[PDB]
Amino acid sequence: DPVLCFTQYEESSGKCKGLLGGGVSVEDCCLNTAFAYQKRSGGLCQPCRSPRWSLWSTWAPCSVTCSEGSQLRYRRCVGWNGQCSGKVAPGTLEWQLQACEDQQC
Amino acid sequence: SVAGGWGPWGPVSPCPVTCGLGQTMEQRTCNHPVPQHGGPFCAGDATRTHICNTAVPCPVDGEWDSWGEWSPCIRRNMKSISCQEIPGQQSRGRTCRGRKFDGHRCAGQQQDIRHCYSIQHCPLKGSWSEWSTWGLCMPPCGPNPTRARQRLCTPLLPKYPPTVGEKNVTFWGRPLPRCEELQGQKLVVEEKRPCLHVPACKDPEE
Ligand SMILES: *[C@@H]1O[C@@H](C)[C@@H](O)[C@@H](O[C@@H]2O[C@H](CO)[C@@H](O)[C@H](O)[C@H]2O)[C@@H]1O
Ligand SMILES: *[C@H]1O[C@H](CO)[C@@H](O)[C@H](O)[C@@H]1O
Ligand SMILES: *[C@H]1O[C@H](CO)[C@@H](O)[C@H](O)[C@@H]1O
Ligand SMILES: *[C@H]1O[C@H](CO)[C@@H](O)[C@H](O)[C@@H]1O
Ligand SMILES: *[C@H]1O[C@H](CO)[C@@H](O)[C@H](O)[C@@H]1O
Ligand SMILES: *[C@H]1O[C@H](CO)[C@@H](O)[C@H](O)[C@@H]1O
Ligand SMILES: *[C@H]1O[C@H](CO)[C@@H](O)[C@H](O)[C@@H]1O
Ligand SMILES: *[C@H]1O[C@H](CO)[C@@H](O)[C@H](O)[C@@H]1O
Ligand SMILES: *[C@H]1O[C@H](CO)[C@@H](O)[C@H](O)[C@@H]1O
Ligand SMILES: *[C@@H]1O[C@@H](C)[C@@H](O)[C@@H](O)[C@@H]1O
Ligand code: NA
Numbered sequence: 001d002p003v004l005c006f007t008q009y010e011e012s013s014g015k016c017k018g019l020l021g022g023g024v025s026v027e028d029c030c031l032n033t034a035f036a037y038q039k040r041s042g043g044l045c046q047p048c049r050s051p052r053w054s055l056w057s058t059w060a061p062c063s064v065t066c067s068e069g070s071q072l073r074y075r076r077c078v079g080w081n082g083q084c085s086g087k088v089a090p091g092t093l094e095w096q097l098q099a100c101e102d103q104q105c
Numbered sequence: 106s107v108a109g110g111w112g113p114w115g116p117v118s119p120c121p122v123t124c125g126l127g128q129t130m131e132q133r134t135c136n137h138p139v140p141q142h143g144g145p146f147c148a149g150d151a152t153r154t155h156i157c158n159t160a161v162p163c164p165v166d167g168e169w170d171s172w173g174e175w176s177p178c179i180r181r182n183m184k185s186i187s188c189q190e191i192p193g194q195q196s197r198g199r200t201c202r203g204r205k206f207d208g209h210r211c212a213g214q215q216q217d218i219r220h221c222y223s224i225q226h227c228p229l230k231g232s233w234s235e236w237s238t239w240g241l242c243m244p245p246c247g248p249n250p251t252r253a254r255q256r257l258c259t260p261l262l263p264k265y266p267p268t269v270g271e272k273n274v275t276f277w278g279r280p281l282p283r284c285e286e287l288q289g290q291k292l293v294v295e296e297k298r299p300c301l302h303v304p305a306c307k308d309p310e311e
Contacts, residue, residue, distance in 0.1 A: 020126055023156070033165050050165075070242055097241060097245035097250050
């Protein structure tokens with residue numbers, strides 16, 4: 001399945017930068033592990049470097065406006081040609097759920 | 106006088122990279138004919154780019170894995186040092202992972218070494234801790250998210266010298282702390298409570 005190939009991956013943001021172009025396999029794109037790719041449809045930019053967990057996202061806001069609720073955050077197995085902690089495939093999300101209260105209500 | 110015209114596309118230039126994919130191109134020039142006495146230059150592109158495959162993989166530099174576990178605390182030429190004021194030594198390692206096609210080896214220490222005291226399987230006097238903070242809600246995406254806090258029988262560590270070439274000595278090993286029963290438990294007391302108004306886990310790229 002042909003992808004869009006990028007010359008640069010941005011660790012901090014997880015953004016694809018410097019489009020080489022399309023009509024290439026991941027296999028060919030990632031011959032250079034400094035490269036990154038995206039599906040033609042868009043969505044998740046994957047680096048060609050070997051898979052490792054991303055940083056946890058910041059906490060999403062409180063499920064309730066002023067009462068006690070909960071809030072989520074995630075990280076993703078991101079990279080190519082291998083697996084993250086716990087025999088895990090690139091693209092795989094891991095989730096944390098925290099109890100939450102916005103204001104003394 | 107004479108309007109410029111483009112000559113034919115020239116050959117594809119050699120791929121400018123020595124590994125993976127690159128950008129090559131074919132070029133043409135405004136010389137068929139060349140513009141003369143104020144006649145226009147050629148409209149459109151002098152260049153046409155392509156992706157070129159070298160079909161050669163680039164080097165991949167090795168990268169340190171995270172430190173392995175500390176080896177057991179032992180003293181050369183002593184059967185057993187556990188539950189005794191006798192410094193031992195232990196080490197832990199890490200592996201250069203992913204180094205490939207003549208990539209760089211990792212820089213820095215492969216092995217980590219320190220002095221320890223062994224309290225492995227050592228029975229110690231304990232006292233009860235205060236409640237931990239509430240843990241995460243588990244499962245975070247499953248149906249019943251419940252969070253927990255615990256009180257633990259905390260071992261009282263022996264008053265051994267912290268250093269002993271004057272070097273740090275670290276307690277190592279899982280002792281067996283002895284406490285008064287609290288709510289019928291000798292080691293762990295746990296509280297649970299449900300997490301409220303639980304969100305649904307949705308892939309943010311879906
Ligand atoms: C030419 O020979 C190849 C075997 C590689 O050693 C090339 O080095 C690579 O150059 C690309 C730029 O195209 C970098 O992304 C790679 O990281 C680098 O190893 C060399 O230029
Ligand atoms: C998420 O968890 C903590 C910080 O909240 C760190 O271990 C790291 O940022 C991780 O990706
Ligand atoms: C060259 O480019 C195109 C032909 O491909 C036209 O704009 C014109 O012939 C120009 O000189
Ligand atoms: C270059 O491109 C095509 C053939 O590759 C033709 O339109 C013409 O040869 C042009 O100069
Ligand atoms: C080993 O050393 C510390 C943890 O003890 C961290 O810097 C990291 O986990 C490294 O691999
Ligand atoms: C060795 O040291 C302690 C255990 O005593 C932890 O930081 C970890 O197990 C490390 O490998
Ligand atoms: C358990 O720990 C000590 C005694 O073992 C006391 O602070 C108290 O009994 C606690 O419940
Ligand atoms: C835990 O519970 C409360 C504090 O939340 C107190 O009774 C005490 O801190 C106990 O350890
Ligand atoms: C769990 O409950 C409160 C509210 O989240 C926390 O602030 C505290 O740490 C306790 O362990
Ligand atoms: C969200 O805002 C807070 C302050 C409360 O008033 C809630 O009832 C409201 O929905
Ligand atoms: Na010891």
